[PDB]
Structure formats: structure tokens, C-alpha cells
Design a protein around this nucleic acid. Structure first.
Length: 54
DNA sequence: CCTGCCAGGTAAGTATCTCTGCCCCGACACAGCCTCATACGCCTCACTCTTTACACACACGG
């Protein structure tokens, strides 16, 4: 199996890929982003994720 | 060492085509005009099942 598949099978079961635990600064950043890219309702969560980490 | 007539069987006959050279040809190019007919080709449009993404919801379980 190529390195690609090994990394895939590791990531798909890597728990450190996502943080899983919320912190206050994460919340502050999320609120700021939502307010920046607000449209009313239905905030684009993808374009928000792509400004956050984990 | 030859030679032949007669009975039986058979048989007629009538009645009721594939090449092969060879002269005397059509159809090729190609010229402008010209009108309508025929063919091709290519991109834009349609659509249709089948996923593809993504915000949101809702048990679920102990």
C-alpha cells in the first residue's frame, strides 16, 4: 500500500485530526466569523471552517 | 475339327458452357454563372439517473 493509502487509513481513524473539545477563544472566533459572513440565516459553515483549525 | 437351326429372351412398335481479347466508348480536370437540392458537422441544448454537497434535525442510550 502506497504512503497515500496508509495516511488515509490513519487520518480516517486519527482522533487528533479534530479537537473535539471547545474553548472560549474558539467560540469568540466562531462568533466573529459568523457575524462577518452573515447573510441573515443560513451562515455558510464551510467558508467558516476554512478560517478555523481543527 | 469345324458348322448351323430352333427355342427363349429381349426389345421395338403399333393400337386404344466458359472464358476471351477487343475496338469504340464514358468519365475523369476544370471555368465562370446560378438555383435549388443534399450532406456533413459541430456546438449548444436537454435531461436524467445518480450521486454530491451541506445546513439541519433527531433520536439514542445508559
Amino acid at each position: 500500500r502506497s504512503a497515500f493509502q496508509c495516511l488515509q487509513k490513519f487520518q480516517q481513524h486519527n482522533k487528533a485530526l479534530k479537537r473535539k473539545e471547545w474553548t472560549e477563544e474558539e467560540d469568540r472566533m466562531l462568533t466573529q466569523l459568523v457575524q462577518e459572513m452573515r447573510v441573515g440565516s443560513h451562515i455558510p459553515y464551510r467558508r467558516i471552517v476554512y478560517y478555523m483549525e481543527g
